[PDB]
Amino acid sequence: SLRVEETEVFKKYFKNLTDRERAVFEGGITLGALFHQFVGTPVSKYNKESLERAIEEAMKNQPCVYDIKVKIRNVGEKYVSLDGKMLDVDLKIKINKTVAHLKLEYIPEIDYPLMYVKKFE
Amino acid sequence: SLRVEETEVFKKYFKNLTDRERAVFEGGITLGALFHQFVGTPVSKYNKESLERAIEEAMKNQPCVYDIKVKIRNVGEKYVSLDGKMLDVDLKIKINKTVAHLKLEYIPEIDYPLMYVKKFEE
Amino acid sequence: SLRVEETEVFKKYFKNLTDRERAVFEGGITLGALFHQFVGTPVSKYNKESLERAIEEAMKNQPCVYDIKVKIRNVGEKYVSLDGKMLDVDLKIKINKTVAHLKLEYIPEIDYPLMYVKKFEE
Amino acid sequence: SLRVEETEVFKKYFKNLTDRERAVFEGGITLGALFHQFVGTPVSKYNKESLERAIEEAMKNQPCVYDIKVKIRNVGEKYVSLDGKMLDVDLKIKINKTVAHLKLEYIPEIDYPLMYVKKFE
Numbered sequence: 209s210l211r212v213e214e215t216e217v218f219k220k221y222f223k224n225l226t227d228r229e230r231a232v233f234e235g236g237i238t239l240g241a242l243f244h245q246f247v248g249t250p251v252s253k254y255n256k257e258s259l260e261r262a263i264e265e266a267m268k269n270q271p272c273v274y275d276i277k278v279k280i281r282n283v284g285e286k287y288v289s290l291d292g293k294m295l296d297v298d299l300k301i302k303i304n305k306t307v308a309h310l311k312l313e314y315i316p317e318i319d320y321p322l323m324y325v326k327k328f329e
Numbered sequence: 330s331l332r333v334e335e336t337e338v339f340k341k342y343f344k345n346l347t348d349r350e351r352a353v354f355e356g357g358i359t360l361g362a363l364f365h366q367f368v369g370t371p372v373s374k375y376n377k378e379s380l381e382r383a384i385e386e387a388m389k390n391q392p393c394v395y396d397i398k399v400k401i402r403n404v405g406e407k408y409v410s411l412d413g414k415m416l417d418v419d420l421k422i423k424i425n426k427t428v429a430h431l432k433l434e435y436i437p438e439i440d441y442p443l444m445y446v447k448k449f450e451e
Numbered sequence: 452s453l454r455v456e457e458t459e460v461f462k463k464y465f466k467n468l469t470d471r472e473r474a475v476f477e478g479g480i481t482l483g484a485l486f487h488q489f490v491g492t493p494v495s496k497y498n499k500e501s502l503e504r505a506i507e508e509a510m511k512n513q514p515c516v517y518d519i520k521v522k523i524r525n526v527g528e529k530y531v532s533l534d535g536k537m538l539d540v541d542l543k544i545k546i547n548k549t550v551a552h553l554k555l556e557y558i559p560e561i562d563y564p565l566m567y568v569k570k571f572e573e
Numbered sequence: 574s575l576r577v578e579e580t581e582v583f584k585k586y587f588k589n590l591t592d593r594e595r596a597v598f599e600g601g602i603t604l605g606a607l608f609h610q611f612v613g614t615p616v617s618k619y620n621k622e623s624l625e626r627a628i629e630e631a632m633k634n635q636p637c638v639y640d641i642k643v644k645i646r647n648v649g650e651k652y653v654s655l656d657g658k659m660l661d662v663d664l665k666i667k668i669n670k671t672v673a674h675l676k677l678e679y680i681p682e683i684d685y686p687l688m689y690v691k692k693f694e
C-alpha cells in the first residue's frame with residue numbers, strides 16, 4: 209500500500225489515541241471534508257448518479273476509509289446548488305481491527321444535517 | 330425545458346449584452362465555478378475518471394453550457410488534493426448562434442492556471 | 452506590480468477579445484469563483500462581517516478586479532451554511548478604460564442567485 | 574445558547590460515545606471542514622490577515638468548538654490558491670469537562686498536511 213496512513217511517521221502522531229478514538233476522529237474528518245468539498249455543486253437528475261459515484265470514490269482515498277455510500281436526496285429536474293441537508297451518507301472507517309460506522313443525514317426535529325456514529329464493530 | 334435561462338425573467342437581465350459578451354460572461358462563470366468547487370478534492374488513479382465525468386455533468390447544468398470536457402493531469406497512484414494547475418478544460422458556451430470555446434490550462438511560463446477564450450464560432 | 456495580468460505572457464492570451472468582452476469574462480470568473488469557494492461556510496451574526504470582508508479581499512487578488520462589495524443577507528444568531536441565495540455582491544472589473552459593473556443577487560421570481568452585468572463605465 | 578449541540582435531540586445521537594471520543598470526532602469534523610471549505614481561496618499578503626480571521630470566526634460556529642487559531646504559511650506578494658500544506662491550525666474542542674487539543678500542520682517527512690490530536694485535558 210502506498211497510502212500515507214501506513215507510514216511509521218503518520219502512525220507516530222496517533223499513539224495517544226485508542227483505536228475507537230482514531231476511528232471516529234478519521235470518520236469526522238471525512239464527513240466534514242465531504243460536506244464542505246461538495247456543497248454548492250450544481251445537481252439535477254441528469255448528474256445525480258455521476259456526482260454520487262464521484263463523491264464516494266473521491267473520499268475513499270482519505271486515510272482509513274474502508275467503505276462509503278453517498279445518496280443525494282430531493283434532486284429535481286431543475287438543477288439546484290447541493291446543500292448539506294440533501295446529503296445521506298454511510299461511512300465505514302477501519303483502524304486495525306476496529307470498524308466505526310458513521311452517518312450523515314438530515315434530522316428534521318433540529319433542522320440539521322447531523323454527523324454521528326451509528327456503531328462500532 | 331425547465332432550464333432557468335429559458336425563462337423570460339432570466340432573459341430580461343441580459344438585454345444589455347451582445348451575444349459574444351454573454352457567451353464569454355457565462356463561460357467565465359463556469360470556469361470560475363468549476364475551479365473553486367473542485368479544487369481540494371482527493372484525486373488518484375482510483376477516482377480520476379469518476380471525478381472528470383462528475384465535473385463535466387455538474388457544469389452542464391449551468392446556464393448556456395453547450396459542452397464541456399475535463400482532463401485532470403499528473404494524477405498518480407497516491408492521492409493528492411486536486412489543485413487548479415492539474416486542470417485541463419475545454420468549454421463551449423452557446424448564445425443563439427454564437428459559440429465561445431473557452432480554455433482552462435496550466436501555463437508554466439507564469440506558473441498559473443489560466444482561463445481564456447480559445448475561439449468563437451458565429 | 453507582481454499581478455499576473457500585468458505580464459506579457461498573460462496578455463497574449465486575450466488579443467481576441469474587446470475590452471468589454473474581456474471585462475465581462477473576468478467578472479464572470481470572479482462571481483463564479485466567489486460563489487463556489489464560499490457557499491457552505493458556517494455563517495452567523497458572530498462572523499458575518501469577517502466573512503464579508505475576507506470574501507472581498509480574497510477576490511481582489513484575481514485578475515482585473517477593481518473593486519468589490521459583499522453583503523450576506525438573512526444572517527441570524529444561529530449559524531447556517533452559507534447559501535448562494537444569501538449573497539448580494541457588486542463587482543467592478545477594469546480593463547484599460549472600460550469598467551464593467553456586475554451583480555450577484557437573489558431573484559425571487561425564478562428562485563435563483565443570478566449573476567449579471569449592471570452597466571459599463573467608459 | 575441557541576447552539577444546536579445543546580439540544581436534547583442532538584445529544585441523544587452521541588450516547589454511544591465517551592467524551593474523549595466525542596471531542597476527537599467533533600475535532601475531526603471541524604478540521605476536515607476547514608480544509609475543504611477554504612482550500613482554493615486566493616491568498617496573498619494583502620488578504621492573509623482577513624482570511625485567517627474569517628476562517629477562525631467561521632469555524633467557531635461549529636458544534637463544540639471552544640477556540641481556534643489559523644495561520645497560513647508561505648504567503649507571498651503574488652497571490653496563490655490556498656493549498657492545504659500552507660495551513661497551520663490549532664483547535665480546541667470542549668465536551669463537558671474534556672478538552673481536546675488538535676493540530677493541522679504540514680509534515681515534510683510524509684509531505685502531508687496532517688490532522689492529529691496534540692493532547693487532552
Ligand SMILES: Nc1nc2c(c(=O)[nH]1)=NC(=O)N=2
Pocket residue numbers: 243292321322323324599602603635636
Ligand atoms: N456532530 C456534528 N454534526 C455536524 C457538524 C458538526 O460539527 N458536528 N457539522 C455538520 O454539518 N453536521
Ligand SMILES: Nc1nc2c(c(=O)[nH]1)=NC(=O)N=2
Pocket residue numbers: 364413442443444445477480481513514
Ligand atoms: N483570466 C483569468 N484566468 C484565471 C483566473 C482569473 O480571474 N482570470 N483565475 C484563474 O484561476 N485563472
Ligand SMILES: Nc1nc2c(c(=O)[nH]1)=NC(=O)N=2
Pocket residue numbers: 355358359391392486535564565566567
Ligand atoms: N447568469 C448566471 N447566473 C448564475 C450562474 C450562471 O451560470 N449564470 N450560476 C449562478 O449561480 N448564478
Ligand SMILES: Nc1nc2c(c(=O)[nH]1)=NC(=O)N=2
Pocket residue numbers: 234237238270271608657686687688689
Ligand atoms: N489524520 C488525517 N489527516 C488528514 C486527513 C485525514 O483524513 N486524516 N486529510 C488531511 O488532509 N489530513
